[PDB]
Design a protein around this nucleic acid. Structure first.
Ligand SMILES: [Mg+2]
Ligand SMILES: [Mg+2]
Ligand SMILES: [Mg+2]
Ligand SMILES: [Mg+2]
Ligand SMILES: [Mg+2]
Lengths: 93, 93, 64, 113, 274, 348
RNA sequence: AUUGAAAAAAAUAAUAUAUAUUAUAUAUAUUAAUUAUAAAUUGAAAUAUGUUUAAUUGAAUAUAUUUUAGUAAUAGAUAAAAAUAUGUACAGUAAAAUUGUAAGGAAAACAAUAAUAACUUUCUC
RNA sequence: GAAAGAAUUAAAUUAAUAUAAUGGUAUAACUGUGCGAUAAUUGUAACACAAACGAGUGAAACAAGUACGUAAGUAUGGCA
């Protein structure tokens, strides 16, 4: 019933011979929402990443400062604000 | 020098286009072969790495290019500007 | 009968033997004890034969 | 023997495990060992010095604050009271961000709110 | 065994005999783990920690300035009360337990240059409850944790037994990892910048959250973990994903101080404070 | 650059090996380590990268620190403080560390490890505290050589004994060893290595080997026995091996009588104690002391009483322990001691 | 030892060889290994021998000979999840309750919750 | 003035002890870990406790051999 991986005999690490787990890590450059780059050590092999949604473009972190895309594409000739004002009578609710 | 081997078998699946590029980027270790003198000891290899040495693992779609830490203001030595030193704490006098 | 008696016979062929109790399907019980005929510690082994609860021999060589 | 899920779990386990992934031990010559020791000791000393400098600075600041507050108490009681309030829910402003490795495109914002 | 009577004999000298050193059994173990000759050696101070540097430079002085209360004396905690000797039965009696609590509470000190609050340790407890059925889920959770941190996780086992929740005793179920120093700092920085902004309706950490003494916590859902860059970069490799608790341990005397410190490192705080 | 100067500073602070020194101080990692003697092994070897420039920077930093310390050290007048300053200055010197770590401390060659130099002496003390001292303390406590002879010990000097004259073999005795009667037939040799700052010219020492476990059948207990007694011995940090060469016949308050344990009397502890003399002011030269040779007895010997009388302070100790064997009778015969008693196997 | 790079030696300990002694010592030489172990028509790598391109090396590709991949947890003298219940050696401290934290709820897991006077070492005013 | 160490004090035996209940146990008898798997060995056992006898219990010491421990030593099954 319980799904498991059944254990083999464990390998005897002798006292003194235990070595610390130094995992393989690459120096990875993260460019945030704006052009601020930051280096971080990372286990996945990718020298450069650029981020879209970060603290540097979130309103909570700076208060002082593709369905939608598809819709935009196929209702482009009409150009869909003025449109909002036209189609927003707040009597009926 | 002390880092583990990069477990490429995990991050790159066998028989895949992404793996192939990674392999091409890499260069393999010299294996032991009978009837030859290796004056830097016999190659100790596991998961395709010389255990006796350090391993190097070479790696919108755009290169992440960081901005210069020195600024235009710094170059000009404009004391009234706030962008003139980026790594130091500036005090209004 | 849960716990049976057995005869451990000395390996140094004195004839000396010591008796101990074990569970019915316990592993073969060999022990090193003093043989007074020989005046030293020798191996003792089970004189009779009996069935054993067959454990799977744990593999250190990583199979498959 | 094993399922594809079981295989993938094993692979994942291996990623974490030290089984056949770790190099030889870092052996040194005696001269090299000494050089290493001298590097480490010096570094440690430097770090201690830096800590003392910072600690000393903090102590100096604390002393200055104490000196100020006594003076304030002596002179203007209301001002002293205003100064010495509970700042329990004081929050650092979200603009004071942790300095990055390299700076952004727009270094400084001149307009706000 | 002739007896079970344990009784350490007194000595006739003040030299402290380290018994480990007198043996020749574990020669590699006599070296400190910091020493290069030990197999346990690891390069500690590999690069300049950024969050720590920031704390040192900007925040620590600001925190000290905030926490200055003029002529603040020590506030003693709830302690074990002694009996008044108004009866001869008080004479070898154990002390009365503390007033409100059963356990003793610590003294709250005034903040000075020495005892400014700072980050002490992060712990990332991930207990996957589906792993009562599937042990492999615990392994996957541990891997995820390792990926996130760059630090070796430790397996959590079911310490208790209960019938209502289908839970046995002594069953591997998720994992934990205590981050300290530079890795912890990095993890915090990632949380602040990458992950927590990608959470949709994220107000912040609750102000009612925390220990009574310098410890604050919160948790991430399985939805939130896919924003970590190590997990995000291979969504094919990560079909399942597990939530986690994140216990931040500070060197703060009280919890409001700890909250303030965390705010300094760009952690938002939303709820009504105690 | 204070550590390159050897005008006022001793020669021992430098490395005497030239090749090693060259390897330590180079501008690039071009040369190969003198420690690795074999060519193939040298070829195989690869030192860790970037180590040179950083090492040089570390040297400069610690050299500067040493120089700064020296600025204080010369202004200081009182001797212990000055010594401490000197230690602080030179302890982080790579060359002195190399010298100390990788060459023998027991039979130190003066040019390599000079115990006249304060830093080296401090290092030696630290080394002693790390292992040998602890071991000695354990052997004193476990065997019950402290309370049985002399209440306590505050180990200051490292004391090592040897029995060169009897057999021929070279071996420093590990504390609490079982030695044969052949081994301990002729006298031992002491080495009292002193690590504290002490007046070498004035300070005298006494050495007493005592046997607490010789049986007294009148008392139905044991009595002590002074097996070997020396007084007024002169030590020097480097010149410290107490041998028939050094001490005169006047120094011998009780000349060596060998361990001759009786059959079934049991194991007999022989615990050497090393005391330093009381130092008298306003008197140039070594202040001697006279021992009343009729007063002190060898067949029964109050060690504590003796110490009280002459105002001694026990700085060091060492211990072996002998029991009966076939050759003890032969030893007795050689020394002209009587046949030797034989006790009942049962302690009834 | 040959090979790379640009007279010797002076610890401990281990290993090899020799001998000293009714003493598990000393002498000389050298600093190995350190998380591995059979079995892979299929993955990956190296070297050797060919052929084609820009005497040459890179690059591509064929065969041979190897090497790797059997991917599996403890990395710490581990310390109150479960497991070897008798020996010995070394080391440590539990529990409850309380305050919190993703699903978690009275009840799953993780964190935190008595006092530092004196002492030693290190840095520093 | 700071960091690190050694730790000490207070509390605790309410957990835990293969198993009832009681006494004992942190100096741990509880727990972890290395080695081991030997002492869950062989002949003589005085002397005590208990005790009608039959039995029962603790056990110094002597001799043979073994395991761990640098050593001191410990082990003739299990905290009782
Ligand atoms: Mg029991
Ligand atoms: Mg009880
Ligand atoms: Mg009676
Ligand atoms: Mg009777
Ligand atoms: Mg027991």
């Amino acid at each position: 019933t319980r799904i498991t991986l059944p254990r083999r005999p464990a390998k005897k690490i002798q006292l003194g011979k235990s070595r610390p787990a130094i995992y393989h890590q690459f120096n990875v450059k993260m460019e945030l929402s704006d052009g601020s780059v930051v280096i971080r050590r990372s286990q996945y092999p990718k020298g450069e990443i650029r981020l879209i949604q970060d603290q540097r473009n979130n309103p909570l972190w700076n208060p002082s400062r593709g369905s939608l895309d598809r819709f935009n594409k196929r209702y482009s000739s009409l150009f869909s604000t003025v449109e909002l004002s036209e189609e927003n009578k707040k009597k009926t609710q | 020098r002390l880092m583990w081997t990069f477990p490429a078998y995990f991050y790159f699946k066998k028989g895949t286009v992404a793996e192939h590029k990674f392999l091409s980027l890499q260069k393999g270790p010299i294996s032991k072969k009978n009837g030859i003198w290796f004056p830097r000891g016999i190659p100790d290899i596991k998961h395709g790495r010389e255990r006796s040495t350090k391993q190097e693992v070479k790696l919108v779609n755009r290169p992440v290019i960081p901005n210069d830490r020195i600024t235009e203001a710094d170059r000009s030595n404009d004391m009234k500007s706030l962008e003139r030193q980026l790594s130091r704490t500036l005090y209004l006098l | 009968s849960k716990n049976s008696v057995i005869k451990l016979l000395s390996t140094a062929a004195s004839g000396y033997s010591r008796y101990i109790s074990i569970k019915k399907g316990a592993p073969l019980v060999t022990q090193v004890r003093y043989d007074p005929v020989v005046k030293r510690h020798v191996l003792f082994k089970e004189a009779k034969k009996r069935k054993v609860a067959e454990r799977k021999p744990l593999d250190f060589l990583r199979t498959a | 023997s094993l399922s594809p899920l079981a295989q993938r779990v094993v692979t994942q386990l291996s990623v974490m495990s030290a089984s056949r992934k770790q190099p030889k031990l870092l052996k040194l010559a005696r001269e090299d060992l000494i050089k290493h020791q001298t590097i480490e000791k010096c570094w440690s000393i430097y770090q201690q010095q830096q800590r003392e400098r910072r600690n000393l600075q903090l102590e100096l600041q604390y002393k200055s604050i104490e000196r100020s507050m006594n003076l304030l108490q002596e002179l203007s009681p209301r001002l002293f009271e205003a100064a010495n309030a509970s700042e329990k829910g004081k929050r650092f402003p979200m603009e004071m961000k942790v300095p990055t490795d390299f700076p952004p495109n727009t270094l400084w914002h001149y307009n706000f709110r | 065994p002739k007896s079970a009577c344990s009784l350490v004999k007194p000595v006739h000298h003040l030299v402290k005999i380290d018994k480990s050193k007198l043996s020749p059994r574990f020669p590699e173990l006599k070296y400190d783990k910091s020493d290069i000759r030990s197999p346990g050696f690891k390069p500690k101070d590999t690069h300049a920690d950024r969050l720590n540097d920031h704390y040192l430079n900007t925040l620590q002085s600001d925190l000290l300035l905030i926490n200055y209360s003029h002529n603040a004396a020590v506030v003693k905690g709830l302690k074990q009360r002694a009996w008044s000797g108004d009866s001869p039965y008080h004479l070898n009696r154990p002390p009365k337990n503390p007033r409100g609590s059963k356990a003793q509470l610590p003294d709250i000190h005034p903040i000075k240059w020495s005892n400014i609050p700072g980050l002490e340790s992060v712990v990332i407890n991930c207990f996957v409850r589906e792993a009562r059925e599937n042990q492999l889920l615990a392994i996957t959770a541990a891997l995820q944790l390792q990926q996130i941190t760059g630090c070796k996780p430790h397996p959590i086992f079911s310490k208790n037994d209960v019938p209502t929740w289908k839970l046995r005793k002594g069953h591997q179920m998720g994992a934990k990892v205590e981050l300290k120093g530079k890795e912890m700092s990095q993890f915090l920085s990632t949380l602040t910048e990458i992950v927590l902004p990608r959470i949709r309706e994220y107000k912040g950490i609750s102000n009612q959250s925390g220990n009574r003494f310098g410890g604050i916590s919160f948790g991430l859902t399985a939805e939130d973990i896919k924003f970590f860059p190590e997990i995000d970069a291979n969504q094919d490799s990560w079909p399942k994903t597990f939530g986690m608790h994140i216990n931040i341990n500070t060197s703060a005397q009280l919890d409001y101080q700890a909250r303030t410190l965390l705010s300094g490192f760009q952690f938002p705080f939303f709820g009504e404070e105690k | 650059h204070i550590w390159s100067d050897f005008t006022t500073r001793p020669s021992s602070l430098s490395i005497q090996s030239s090749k090693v020194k060259n390897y330590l101080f180079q501008k690039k990692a071009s040369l190969d380590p003198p420690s690795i003697s074999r060519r193939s092994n040298r070829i195989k070897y690869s030192p860790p990268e970037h180590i040179d420039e950083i090492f040089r920077m570390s040297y400069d930093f610690l050299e500067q620190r040493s120089s700064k310390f020296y600025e204080l050290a010369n202004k200081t007048k009182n001797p212990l403080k000055k010594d401490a300053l000197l230690i602080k200055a030179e302890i982080n010197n790579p060359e002195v560390q190399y010298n100390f770590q990788f060459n023998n401390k027991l039979n130190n060659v003066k040019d390599i490890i000079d115990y006249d130099v304060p830093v080296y002496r401090h290092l030696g003390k630290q080394h002693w505290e790390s292992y040998g001292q602890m071991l000695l303390m354990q052997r004193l406590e476990t065997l019950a050589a402290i309370p049985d002879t002399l209440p306590t010990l505050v180990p200051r000097a490292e004391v090592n004994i040897k029995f060169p004259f009897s057999t021929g073999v070279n071996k420093w005795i590990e504390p609490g060893e079982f030695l044969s009667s052949n081994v301990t037939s002729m006298r031992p040799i002491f080495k009292i290595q002193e690590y504290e700052l002490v007046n070498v010219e004035k300070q005298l020492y006494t050495v007493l080997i005592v046997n607490p476990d010789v049986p007294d059948l009148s008392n139905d207990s044991f009595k002590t026995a002074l097996c070997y007694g020396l007084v007024n011995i002169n030590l020097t940090y480097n010149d410290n091996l107490i041998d028939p060469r050094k001490f005169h016949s006047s120094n011998i308050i009780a000349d060596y009588l060998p361990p001759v344990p009786e059959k079934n009397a049991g194991k007999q502890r022989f615990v050497v104690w090393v005391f330093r003399q009381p130092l008298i002011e306003d008197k140039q030269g070594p202040n001697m002391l006279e021992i009343d040779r009729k007063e002190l007895s060898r067949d029964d010997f109050d060690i504590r009483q003796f110490t009280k009388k002459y105002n001694l302070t026990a700085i060091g100790a060492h211990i072996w322990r002998s029991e009966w064997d076939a050759k003890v009778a032969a030893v007795r015969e050689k020394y002209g001691l009587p046949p030797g008693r034989v006790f009942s196997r049962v302690r009834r």
